Swiss-Prot record, chains A, B:
GO molecular function, one term: carbonate dehydratase activity
Part of the intact protein present: 31 to 290 of 354
Source organism of this protein record: Homo sapiens
Domain Alpha-carbonic anhydrase: 1-259
Result, substituting H91Q: In HYCHL; severe decrease of activity in the presence of physiological NaCl concentrations; no effect on localization to cell membrane
UniProt name for this protein: Carbonic anhydrase 12
Amino acid sequence: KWTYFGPDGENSWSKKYPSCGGLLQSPIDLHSDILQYDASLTPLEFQGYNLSANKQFLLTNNGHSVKLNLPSDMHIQGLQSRYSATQLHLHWGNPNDPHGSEHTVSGQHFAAELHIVHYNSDLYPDASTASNKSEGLAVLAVLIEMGSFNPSYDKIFSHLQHVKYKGQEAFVPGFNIEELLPERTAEYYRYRGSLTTPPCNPTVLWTVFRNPVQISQEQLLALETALYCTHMDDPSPREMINNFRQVQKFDERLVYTSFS
Amino acid sequence: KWTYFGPDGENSWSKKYPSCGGLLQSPIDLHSDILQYDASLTPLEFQGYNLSANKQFLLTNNGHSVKLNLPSDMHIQGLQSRYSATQLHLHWGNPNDPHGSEHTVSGQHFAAELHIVHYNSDLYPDASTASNKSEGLAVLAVLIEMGSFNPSYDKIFSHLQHVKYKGQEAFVPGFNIEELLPERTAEYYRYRGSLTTPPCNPTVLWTVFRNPVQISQEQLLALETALYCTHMDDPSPREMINNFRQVQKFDERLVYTSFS
Ligand SMILES: [Zn+2]
Ligand SMILES: [Zn+2]
């Protein structure tokens, strides 16, 4: 078992999950000194992202975040290998400190962060197998800030009150996942890292988009208040808040950008 | 043993030192969301800080930082109990990414940070006894940024080559330690935290001065390249750089300021 606060918090993950204290750890702070433009970083192509509205996708509260299962038919094109989707989830703070993104830019947190996880389907049969293997995963990260209401993110948020407790599930009709991506996806940060949750495998090729998307104050508050990491029948409910990992040391290395 | 990098790095400290994975861990990001102005935070008085130039004080490279032993004759006045000095040391980054302070302000790291450690001499006989006990320590933190040459800090930096390797010691003539403090010392952040190195005891009353001091690019570079964490003539010399802990989560608004 692990958590983001208390005895089994992030500073203790390495006790049971060695990789959490190992190399290529994520997330990290993106600042000028360690950023470098790479003109060779071309735009990624998102295929099969427009999920059929006649299909249902499972939304689950797994006690650590709210996750939406994705089909392997949606994939990223543009990398050395094809990466097929497996799931997406989010990271956020709390009402008193609404700055829970994992990656930070110039030391600044964003309100929240979306992670769309994919696995190398060319080399591996499924995400479970690819998770702890070379070039096994590719994750898209979208920084989220407070602003205008976002109808696309609400296609997920409107179901939050039905996955309030650990183990609960809900069905989300397919919608265009590309609608969750920011403007100018051609512009992004790229680096080799890890899962930001145990087991922290250093098998993730990260793509953090440069521009953030906006969601309303209400949408952010809902995300920060609707979920609990405890089962519904638990006499002592625990709010699912501040479910983000602190930035990790990033030395002797560079994050490359597709923008100058 | 422990280090700031490798399998014995900060994510693994809790394996041997339980408190490093406990509550009230430092350093933290000093940002509005957790700050609160307090008028009871009156100016501190630094007494006995003008060390006799006719006396020598021990400077040591302990493999983690450069430390100067201080006499219990110097102490802080203004707190509930008297806190007597025991030692001072520094934390820094590296030439390619010169942002190695421990505490951050509004997410921003400073070039380096000075810590002047004191123990509660009213309650305890010495620093060792006080270290893991209630109200045991008080630390003054000075943020350092690159700027104009600093003659006072050079009274320490000029001795760096004498303690280039781990285990080495040197003598530093006494000088006014108050010269190392920034302007407007009356302005500071105050919070209850911990030692930022193992054993990470949550027994430190922190006073981080609001305003930073400046040292020249040359002084900062000297600090970042003059020391090694390895013994003299080691077959695989290792430079002492990035010897600072990552910021820790700090929930509630329990950081007070003596300014508005
Ligand atoms: Zn994630
Ligand atoms: Zn220190």
